[PDB]
């Protein structure tokens, strides 16, 4: 408890009272860390409770199960479900463990010492102590350095993960030979983010996604030790602001950018977000239309190569602006697509005309007919067609919930950046309260 | 003096005695906006007609090609390019660049980078004068809106042709095609933004009336009332208790701000929060989460569908769905 006339901060900016209170602030993050785990456990058990394992997973309005199912729990070949007991365990595991975080969040926020500076010296910190901040930085870098390795160990030893590029439908594969070449790994980071290149969303095989985390597992274990034994250099003293709110706004600039990437990766990447589990992408469902409606000419026998459209461009197959054999219509904008139901139909010169007339597997059309129907475009009350579509079905894609939520969540943090990074720069200078009215700096300047 | 060449240079950029402040955002804002301005003028006057849809029917947008101010536009990049980075040097000839939708993607990339940094130097000067820094926050409400109509919406659709053209009649087509595909008027984020400006205009007409209506008598009647205020004065130019006393009688006393610092915060916070939702509106509508849809919703017994007004707005949308991009769709769905 705290009043207003001892701190100035009102009831609504109340959590800013515990900036200089180390111990109360520690209970504030622990209690909040309970609620993230508590949401993880409760929403998982809720989605298992309403889960029909015979319908596809993305049809039933599910977002947390395909996260667990991508790792390869209770899944078999093609994407179907073997058993739903491991989906029950993690919802139980997070929910009980949240109460352990819940008790420590209640404890330090009420009864534990409000400033753990002079009593507990390893934990006590002043916001200007630079060596102590780089320690508390460097400890946690190990904690998510090691956390990166759990995905690595589970992909090479513990059954592997669901690899949607498996031959003959997607299947769980143990990653045996992870691609750890630095020129291959760091080629994604300095790649352009525009179309055809796709900055980090275009990582297309499971060998790199597992192969990447060996780097990031090693680096912030190496970098975590670096910040423990070193202090920031005098150029970093000349560059940054060393307060408490300044450290926050540095983070808010980071996880604003984190949200925009997960906004785009769940919309485009059907490798870490497999289309059997999260539903098809926008580019996948649009390219599924022209493929399925080219099967509809093969049962009538008209020449798909000679099928000229109304504008003289090619009703079914046409040429890319870099000269490749692609589909036609308004889906010409999606010719950068690659998919495991489509890539066994492509040769050197794009998709092969001789191969498509003869070498269509039956299961490929069986998957590319679900993806014609379950295109991600829908309404807000979950109607699920174009805006000129009547109340018939009930489907909006999990890719469309994840791309919309994590855009807006990852947007206000950039507004969260511009709030605090201005305020922390002002309050470190002195004039966060206002103009002094005795020596304002405008009156000491030349006019105009 | 003993100062370096570099320190001479940094005590000129951050000098607050230039006529227009530059700052460190302005060293990359100014060469991006003057790029984007000087290419916008040329393509608004002399651009050859652009294939916008990839069906090789070029759309005119220049004043020299029989357009006026209203029908002039800078036509978006073609559908065949999509999201491929298409600078000037990837085109073989310069005229191949112009026909394919060249200067749209050159402007937007320099424009959006320019207005992210115009927000930057609104912070930077406010640190150079001892001001409190949150004007740069309030400029993020149009910056959120302009990032959506140029960049966030072509991502979710997959092509820069569906972005908004740089023209007055070009905008009006983008408003029509959008509501035909996404039904923006039945989305609560467009409802907040509409209240963001109808409330925003009301809060400017009402606030600006009462300050004018409480001015202290200092001039004659032949002289204008603006001559009572002299610049840089200390004493207050209008009675504040009288305006709260007036507006307290008008509706009731609890419905007014007596604290003028709490008043001017409310004038800033109402439209800025309102534009943030209508900026996030078509950001979420970019990823195909359209709005409400109450078609065939009121049904009685014996299975008969009663019209509402929502079925009338359906007929408007259904009349525009089957007319936009009139020679594009070979297939009975508009997935692109």
């Amino acid at each position: 408890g705290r009043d207003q006339e001892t701190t100035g901060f009102a009831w609504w900016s109340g959590n800013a009272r515990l900036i200089n209170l180390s111990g109360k602030l520690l209970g504030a993050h622990v209690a909040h860390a309970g609620l993230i785990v508590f949401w993880a456990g409760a929403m998982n058990l809720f989605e298992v409770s309403h889960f029909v394992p015979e319908k596809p997973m993305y049809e039933q309005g599910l977002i947390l199960l395909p996260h667990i199912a991508t790792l390869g729990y209770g899944v078999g070949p093609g994407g179907e479900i073997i058993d739903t007991f491991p989906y029950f365990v993690s919802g139980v595991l997070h929910l009980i463990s949240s109460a352990v975080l819940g008790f420590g969040g209640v404890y330090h926020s009420l009864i534990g010492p409000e400033t753990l500076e002079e009593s507990y010296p390893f934990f006590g910190y002043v916001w200007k102590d630079k060596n102590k901040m780089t320690n508390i930085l460097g400890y946690h870098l190990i904690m998510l350095g090691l956390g990166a390795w759990l995905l690595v160990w589970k992909a090479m030893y513990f059954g592997g993960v669901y690899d949607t590029w498996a031959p003959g439908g997607g299947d769980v594969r143990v990653i045996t030979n992870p691609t750890t070449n630095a020129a291959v790994i760091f080629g994604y980071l300095v790649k352009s983010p525009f179309g055809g290149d796709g900055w980090i969303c275009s990582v297309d095989n499971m060998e790199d996604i597992i192969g990447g985390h060996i780097w990031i597992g090693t680096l912030e274990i190496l970098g975590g030790i670096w910040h423990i034994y070193t202090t920031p250099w005098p150029w970093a003293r000349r560059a940054f602001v060393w307060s408490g709110e300044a450290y926050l706004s540095y983070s808010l600039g980071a996880i604003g950018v984190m949200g925009f990437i997960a906004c785009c990766m769940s919309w485009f990447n059907n490798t870490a977000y497999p289309s059997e589990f999260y539903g098809p992408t926008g580019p996948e469902a649009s390219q599924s239309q022209a493929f399925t409606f080219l099967v509809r000419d093969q049962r009538l026998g008209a020449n798909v190569a000679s099928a000229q459209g109304p504008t003289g461009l090619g009703k079914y197959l046409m040429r890319s602006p870099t000269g490749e054999i692609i589909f036609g219509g308004e889906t010409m904008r999606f010719w950068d697509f690659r998919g495991p139901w489509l890539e066994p139909l492509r040769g050197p010169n794009g998709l092969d005309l001789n191969k498509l007339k003869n070498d269509i597997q039956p299961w490929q059309e069986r998957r590319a007919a679900e993806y014609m129907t379950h295109a991600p475009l829908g309404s807000l009350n979950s109607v699920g067609g174009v805006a000129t579509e009547i109340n018939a079905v009930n489907f909006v894609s999990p890719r469309s919930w994840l791309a919309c939520s994590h855009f807006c969540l990852g947007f206000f943090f950039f507004i969260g950046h511009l709030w605090h990074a201005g305020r922390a720069r002002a309050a470190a200078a002195g004039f966060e309260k206002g103009i002094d009215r005795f020596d304002e700096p405008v009156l000491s300047m030349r006019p105009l | 003096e003993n100062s370096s060449l570099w320190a001479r240079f940094c005590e000129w950029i951050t000098s607050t005695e230039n006529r227009l402040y530059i700052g460190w955002f302005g060293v990359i804002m100014i060469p991006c906006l003057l790029t984007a301005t000087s290419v916008f003028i040329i393509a608004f006057i002399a651009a050859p007609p652009v294939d916008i849809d990839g069906i090789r029917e070029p759309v005119s947008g220049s004043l020299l090609y029989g357009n006026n101010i209203i029908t002039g536009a800078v036509i978006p990049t073609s559908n065949a390019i999509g999201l491929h980075f298409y600078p000037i040097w990837e085109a073989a000839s310069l005229d191949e660049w112009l026909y394919n939708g060249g200067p749209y993607q050159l402007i937007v990339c320099h424009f959006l980078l320019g207005v992210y940094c115009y927000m930057g130097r609104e912070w930077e000067l406010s640190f150079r004068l001892g001001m409190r820094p949150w004007i740069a926050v309030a400029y993020s409400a149009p910056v959120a809106a302009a990032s959506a109509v140029f960049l966030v919406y072509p991502i979710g659709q997959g092509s820069f042709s569906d972005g908004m053209p740089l023209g007055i009649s070009g905008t009006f087509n983008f408003m029509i095609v959008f509501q035909a595909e996404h039904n923006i008027l039945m989305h609560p984020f467009h409802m907040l933004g509409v209240a963001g400006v109808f409330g925003g205009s009301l809060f400017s007409a009402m606030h600006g009336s009462l300050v004018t209506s409480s001015l202290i008598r200092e001039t004659t009647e032949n002289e204008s009332a603006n001559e009572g205020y002299r610049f840089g004065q200390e004493e207050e130019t209008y009675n504040i208790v009288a305006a709260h006393g007036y507006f307290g009688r008008l509706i009731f006393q609890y419905a007014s701000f007596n604290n003028s610092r709490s008043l001017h915060f409310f004038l800033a916070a109402w439209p800025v929060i309102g534009i943030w939702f209508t900026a996030l509106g078509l950001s979420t509508m970019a990823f195909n989460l359209n709005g409400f849809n109450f078609n065939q919703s009121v049904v009685d017994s014996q299975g008969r569908v009663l019209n509402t007004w929502a079925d009338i707005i359906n007929r408007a949308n259904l009349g525009m769905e089957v007319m936009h991009e009139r020679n594009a769709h070979n297939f009975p769905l508009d997935l692109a």
């Binding site: - | 029989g66 006026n68 101010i69 840089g232």
Partner: peptide
């Protein structure tokens, strides 16, 4: 013909915007 009448009135507006910034009436204090 009107294509040059339009461009007069566009750069005419940009004329005043040049003169309204640099040749403005300088606000003298007090």
């Amino acid at each position: 013909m009107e294509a040059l009448v339009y461009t007069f009135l566009l750069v005419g507006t940009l004329g005043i915007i040049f003169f309204s910034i640099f040749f403005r009436d300088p606000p003298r204090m007090i």
